[PDB]
Write a structure and sequence with these properties.
Belongs to the TTC21 family. With 158 residues, the chain is mostly helical. The chain has nine helices and no strands. The N and C termini lie far apart (45 Å).
């Protein structure tokens, strides 16, 4: 159904797309992550970010230790919430989870390093944390020159 979800999300037939989502995590709450993040995916695609973080908190209820839940929350601290300044501690919570969740992935983590730092900006408390994101990207590989590029982009913002 996710292919049909992707089919309807591309077509922006979100009335039938979201109905497919709502009959996905209700019928399949055991899987939880694919449809509920998928609803949280669609909600911010329909720009319903205030709903998406509430879904994320519901996802956090099922499992707080999900990086995708902690990324969505840290995304909402950057997307819509005008209550930032606690965010460096909030993204640190996400920063701890990414330390243990992917100690194998070079390609995803390099993009994860440059993306989530570019969310933050010139906030040095964020910049101190988000550079450590590029540290693990540097930890797994450095011969791929994009790794020092994203870290250098942080050093560009440093």
């Amino acid at each position: 159904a996710l292919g049909y979800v992707a089919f309807l999300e591309r077509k922006t037939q979100l009335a039938k797309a979201q109905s497919l989502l709502d009959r996905l995590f209700v019928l399949y709450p055991n899987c939880s992550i694919p449809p509920l993040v998928g609803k949280a995916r669609l909600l911010m695609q329909a720009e319903d970010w205030e709903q998406a973080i509430e879904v994320t908190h519901r996802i956090l209820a099922h499992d707080k230790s999900n990086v995708e839940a902690l990324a969505l929350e840290a995304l909402y601290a950057m997307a819509k919430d005008t209550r930032h300044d606690a965010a460096p501690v909030r993204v640190r919570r996400l920063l701890d989870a990414v330390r243990a969740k992917e100690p194998r992935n070079v390609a995803l983590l390099h993009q994860f390093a440059l993306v989530f730092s570019r969310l933050a900006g010139d906030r040095l408390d964020l910049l101190s944390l988000t550079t450590q994101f590029s540290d693990m990207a540097y930890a797994l590989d450095s011969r791929n020159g994009d790794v020092l590029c994203g870290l250098g982009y942080q050093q560009l913002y440093r």
